[PDB]
Amino acid sequence: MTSILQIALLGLVLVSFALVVGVPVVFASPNGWTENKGVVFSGLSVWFLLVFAVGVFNSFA
Amino acid sequence: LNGFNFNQSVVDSNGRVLNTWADIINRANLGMEVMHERNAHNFPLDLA
Amino acid sequence: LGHASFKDQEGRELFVRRMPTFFETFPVVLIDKDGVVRADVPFRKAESKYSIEQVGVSVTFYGGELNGLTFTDPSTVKKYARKAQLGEIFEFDRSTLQSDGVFRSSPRGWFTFGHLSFALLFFFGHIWHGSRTIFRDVFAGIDED
Amino acid sequence: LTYDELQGLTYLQVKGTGIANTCPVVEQGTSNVRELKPGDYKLEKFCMEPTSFTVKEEDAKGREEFVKTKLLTRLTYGLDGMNGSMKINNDGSVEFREDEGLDYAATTVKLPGGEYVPFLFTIKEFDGKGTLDSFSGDFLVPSYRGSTFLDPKGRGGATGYDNAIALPAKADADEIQRLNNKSYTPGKGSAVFSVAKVDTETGEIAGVFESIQPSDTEMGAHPAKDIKITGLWYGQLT
Amino acid sequence: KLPEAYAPFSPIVDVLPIIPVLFILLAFVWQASVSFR
Amino acid sequence: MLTLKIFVYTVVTFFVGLFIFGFLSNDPSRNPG
Amino acid sequence: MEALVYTFLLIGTLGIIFFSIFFREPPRIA
Amino acid sequence: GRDQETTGFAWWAGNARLINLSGKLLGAHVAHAGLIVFWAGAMNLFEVSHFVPEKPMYEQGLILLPHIATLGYGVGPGGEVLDTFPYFVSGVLHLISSAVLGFGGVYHSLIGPETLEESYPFFGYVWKDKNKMTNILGYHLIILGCGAWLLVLKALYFGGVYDTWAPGGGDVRIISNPTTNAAIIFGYIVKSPFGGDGWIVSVDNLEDIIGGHIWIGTLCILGGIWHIYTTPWPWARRAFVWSGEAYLSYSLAAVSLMGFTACCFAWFNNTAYPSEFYGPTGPEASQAQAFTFLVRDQRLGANVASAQGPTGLGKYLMRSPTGEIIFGGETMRFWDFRGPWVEPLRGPSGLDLVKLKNDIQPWQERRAAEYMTHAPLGSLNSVGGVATEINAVNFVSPRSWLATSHFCLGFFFFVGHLWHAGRARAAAAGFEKGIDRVDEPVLSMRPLD
Amino acid sequence: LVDDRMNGDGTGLPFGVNDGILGWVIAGTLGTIWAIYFVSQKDLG
Amino acid sequence: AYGEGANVFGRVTNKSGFVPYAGDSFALLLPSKWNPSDQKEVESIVLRYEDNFDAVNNLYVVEDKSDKSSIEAYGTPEEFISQFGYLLGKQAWAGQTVSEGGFDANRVSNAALLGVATEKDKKGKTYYKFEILTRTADGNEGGRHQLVKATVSNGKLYLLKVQAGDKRWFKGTDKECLGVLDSFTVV
Amino acid sequence: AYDFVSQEIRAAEDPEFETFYTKNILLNEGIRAWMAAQDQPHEKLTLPEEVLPRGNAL
Amino acid sequence: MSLTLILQLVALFAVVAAGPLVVVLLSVRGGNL
Ligand code: CLA
Ligand code: CLA
Ligand code: CLA
Ligand code: CLA
Ligand SMILES: CC1=C(/C=C/C(C)=C/C=C/C(C)=C/C=C/C=C(C)/C=C/C=C(C)/C=C/C2=C(C)CCCC2(C)C)C(C)(C)CCC1
Ligand SMILES: CC1=C(/C=C/C(C)=C/C=C/C(C)=C/C=C/C=C(C)/C=C/C=C(C)/C=C/C2=C(C)CCCC2(C)C)C(C)(C)CCC1
Ligand SMILES: CC1=C(/C=C/C(C)=C/C=C/C(C)=C/C=C/C=C(C)/C=C/C=C(C)/C=C/C2=C(C)CCCC2(C)C)C(C)(C)CCC1
Ligand SMILES: [Cl-]
Ligand SMILES: [Cl-]
């Protein structure tokens, strides 16, 4: 499960890149937040899911 | 914490130390160090 | 006093290193003809390496007051080497003028110092009095721009 | 504070109170000193504590009198931890000897008119003799300053200058005493000890002592002054 | 060192600590973007 | 030396108390504004 | 005697400071 | 954002535009808190990635790992690192929490309400509503008290913390019977700050530390409740200035004092900052050098007790001004040093001559030598030793880094007390922008001062 | 012992109060200044 | 050469810290940071190098004719090292002193023999090896460590002596001194 | 303005008179001795370590 | 040249460009800065 943990961690790093570079853009954009609530919610949810997956994979192996 | 210590920072191809103005400053510092308190030191390192 | 020639117990002639003009105090070192230090008056008498007693240095004076006189006791040899680091050794009568024992400067040194300081101050004089010359109209005040 | 009372206290209960400099005092002994059992004893835990310092001074009329002084070096004048031998004889004869321990202390009293008198209060190699009521003897007094000590201008024995280099034209016989005459010759002092109390069961003794030793000669620069030191001493036998 | 699973991600960890000093520079960049309004 | 110590303690306490209770006595209202 | 001269010079400087503080010429407005 | 025309503050004082914008101020403070946690996590990960457990922690320039190790978490007897995993866990946790806090700061700074007074009355302070400000102080005071009790619980029922005074080389001990005596605990604060006393820096037991944190946690919770349920007294209203900048200035003064205290704690104390992780102190290194040379010359025959130095004062041993036997030389200035490796050699009257002859154990000698070779002396470019060295060793003691950095921070925050406090006073009075130019106070005063 | 000393240096004495007279004079001076302030100004709490 | 070119993106020559040296009949490795020295305290010194920073750290090789057929003809190694008592300097001070700790009466310097032994060689050559610690009343640099390696070949005695301050010895000069002592090889 | 001759003479006559000025003179002496050899190569000063002024155990 | 060095440089460039990139995107988009 070491390889699985590593690819999950890379996915988490990529999702964090996306969130860091997008959340300020969505927030400061005019009317951007209202039309992008779902996208940001999906991003945060998958980010937290990846965090917990990395945690459980670390626990396993 | 002290200042920069570039003593013997420049060495040649074979490893010989090439002196710099920092080395002359260090020579003067050594001159001051071995004389500042003639009788107060019983051990080689000041540390105080 | 004469000229002091220092010779070790081997017979190798030793020369005392003269004090450079920069040094108020200079350590005593007796040097071989080939520039190899052969004796000195060490600062640390413990485990000394080139001590006068260890090397056995004797001083013979040629000419002057002490002519053909040889001294071998280490105290006298140390004293005369310390004197010879200053150049030729002379006898001085210090009781007459109550000499303190620190070198003064010759009249050429005092002349040079005084007239150099005057030269600097008069460079400032050139600057000041010439600025006053060129700016005479405005040195009573300025009418804004 | 007897030996046990001092020993029970911890460092944190003693640091800062000045108790350390005090020597222990026997408390439940007997003043009858003749009752001590004769024999040879390894005298250890030997300590000395002065109670006064007086400096000899000779006046215009020649009346050499001892003048009281004021101490300057705080509570750094107690000798302790010394070891030695002692032979109590049947008639009371005593062969006292001191070998090791903190048997010297550099102190500096001040004389009226403002005179700083330093000296090594020491009992080094005190080979005493006499009766059990009072035994006297001589002890070594080392030079106050070691050979490697440098004077304010760098002069000194061993490591030093042997010359007043600040005067490149004055190193003559007018300064023979100050230059190269750094005489570190040890002197001698006289001491007298009287036993006051003895605890036979503990095997410890305590009493009074009086000593006379020269002051600091400052490496032979000026003559030594006689120092009289009275105090109380303690020790343990075997 | 890091546990053997996280060994390949060592460069990211070696780069991370300098971000806080990047935030103040980002604030200066943002102010410059608005002509220091 | 005890008398000197108690005297200095009294002096220091007096001055420090003056400071503390002077800065409390409605100081912020002592401005021209 | 040198100590006497030094003390006199220091006392003179301090007295000059005292006079320049408490006996200054008033700053005349306009 | 804002502009200078509508606010009166230029860009180089732009955060001053947030004084009366409660929501954006909350966002800014949350963002800076996220920054603090992010540095904590990232630097912890950096340290563990660059850490080799074979070498001592202070050899490798680590500041956070000693902090974690002092709380237990993977250290064996003598301060030996067993598991580096807890350090990694701490780094990851602080880092992820920092990500959350950064998102929160961004939200409350960009999209959240600019002013919270209307929509969220519970968070709508006014910088002069004394009751509300005391309520906020009480909430955060309760949080601080809970943190102190958290430390107490860690030391009591969760494996204890690293006692460097434990017999041997020190070990992780569970502190039982904390010092809960009022006289002992409060005697530290009224203790002198000079030598031999050291104020609170001279705390030496773990029991004293745990009892003190017990008292501080309980008092902080009680004071939080008190400041929640009460309004400042009428005398308190007149004594203080009531504005946001005034509160900032008070906090600046407090944390400058705390920074100076932390600098001195890191430099002097070795109980809460064990030398196994932070390295020896200055006094510790000096005493270690003296001890090492004493044992070396004592092994080579000789009698250190009677050995007289060049000054005639004692080459190895002498008497402290109070009378306690102490190491000779310059290290006599550090006679009040106390360490785990030197206390066994101290009798009632200080260093014991008998114990110094035969009671010395080899581990003490090894630790003393190691401390002597790693004295807290270094250069700016991390070159170990005195200023006159050969530029061969790469070492500056973590104690030196902590002391220097937090002293600089303490001084600058004292200057902050000065600046922000003077400005608060002037703004309250009305002089913040300058003299009136129509009614100067000076023109209403008699001449000649 | 050749003289008398305070023997207080290097001790955890509160405010340096080795003897109660010092604490009493400290309390008296502070309380007197406080009484002056209280009877002049208004302290209530 | 003038057109040789720089060493951009190149490789170092050596980082061992020791450089070879070939004598009249001996081979040696000297520290890179140590400079050649001119002074000859003993007229029979044929080689000398000194540390750039602390001149107390130095070494010199002495080659002088010997009547003894082999180094073993001197006798025991301790007897041999007792023969060369002048290599530890001379106490020029001659004053009666007892106020120095750890030293006998009227003495300001003391040499302690930490250990002696005999070594071998690729050709079976025997070398006398000595380690000494010299302390002084002023305690200069906390004493001085002296390493001596002596051999007799072709009617000549070769003696290498390395001196290091204890202050320098504690902080890494021991490696350099031991390397110098090990590398000393004679035919 | 290297020296005050009165203080030098007093120190020479009195081996226990010390001021910060004399300590500064000693420091200057150390600086000169330990810097001359490498600061002024043209002098070719091969001073043995036993002639360099030095304190105790330093 | 080193793989760790290559990854370090890549991560450094990414994190450095992250801030100016979002600033530029908000400027071109018209977001309130
Ligand atoms: C950590 C320090 C810090 C913090 C927390 C703040 C916070 C704040 N500042 Mg400020 N500022 C700072 C430092 C700081 N500043 C410094 C050093 C200066 C001197 C140059 C200034 C000068 C300044 C001025 C002149 C002004 C502010 C203003 C503001 C407020 C409005 C921000 C805004 O909407 O702008 C716009 C926001 C953007 C352009 C978006 C770009 C930046 C975002 C936050 C991206 C962050 C990147 C990050 C990785 C995102 C992580 C996402 C997460 C999910 C992981 C805000 C609460 C304004 C104010 O007064 O409020 C009314 C104002 O005018 N500041
Ligand atoms: C950092 C947390 C904190 C803060 C910011 C405040 C702030 C405040 N408190 Mg509060 N308090 C706190 C914690 C805190 N308190 C705790 C934990 C408790 C429980 C014990 C209390 C109990 C308390 C009470 C009972 C009262 C206050 C009051 C006040 C207000 C008046 C302040 C004052 O009297 O001026 C300054 C204070 C003084 C000049 C007196 C100093 C007293 C201390 C103990 C001196 C100790 C000196 C000692 C030698 C240590 C010196 C070392 C030092 C240099 C570090 C003020 C806004 C008063 C109030 O307004 O009622 C609401 C009030 O009656 N507080
Ligand atoms: C560049 C900014 C900067 C940086 C990088 C640091 C960094 C550091 N500071 Mg510093 N500081 C700064 C600015 C900075 N500071 C400023 C501006 C000031 C004001 C002048 C201070 C004042 C200051 C003080 C007073 C102290 C530090 C300290 C420290 C060190 C420890 C940090 C810490 O743990 O804090 C504190 C951590 C918290 C507040 C959160 C703790 C929350 C709980 C209680 C943790 C408990 C965990 C628990 C036991 C585990 C769970 C157990 C459970 C299972 C039961 C650290 C290396 C400390 C130090 O080491 O002294 C040298 C110290 O005491 N700093
Ligand atoms: C928690 C502490 C704190 C807080 C919340 C504030 C808050 C505030 N300050 Mg203040 N200040 C503080 C501490 C603090 N300050 C300290 C410690 C000092 C002393 C140095 C000052 C000195 C100060 C001045 C002179 C001014 C303020 C001003 C202000 C207001 C606007 C600040 C701003 O955005 O400017 C913009 C921020 C910047 C331009 C960034 C500055 C860049 C710094 C210098 C970089 C230094 C980093 C360096 C590498 C660290 C090394 C430190 C040391 C280890 C060597 C604001 C409300 C202004 C005001 O008057 O209020 C109306 C103002 O003029 N402050
Ligand atoms: C991967 C991994 C892991 C795991 C991890 C995790 C999963 C973590 C988590 C993390 C988290 C998930 C954290 C949390 C965070 C959050 C935060 C930090 C926030 C808080 C809050 C606040 C701060 C605020 C609050 C409030 C409000 C909002 C309202 C009012 C009131 C108050 C203010 C209170 C492990 C272990 C295996 C290790 C290894 C790696
Ligand atoms: C308001 C504003 C400001 C500020 C801002 C800020 C400061 C924010 C915050 C921010 C932040 C502070 C954020 C955070 C982030 C973080 C994150 C997002 C994390 C992530 C993680 C991950 C992705 C993973 C990792 C890993 C692990 C865990 C394991 C090991 C390895 C690694 C490390 C890889 C400014 C100045 C601009 C100005 C303007 C306004
Ligand atoms: C934890 C722990 C402990 C304990 C500690 C403690 C017990 C603490 C507390 C402390 C404290 C108890 C503190 C307090 C402080 C206070 C203060 C610092 C005050 C100040 C004052 C002020 C700031 C005011 C001012 C003013 C006046 C005077 C006048 C008018 C105006 C005003 C009001 C502003 C120990 C040691 C065991 C160590 C270990 C840890
Ligand atoms: Cl000095
Ligand atoms: Cl020392």
Ligand code: NA
């Ligand atoms: Na010295």
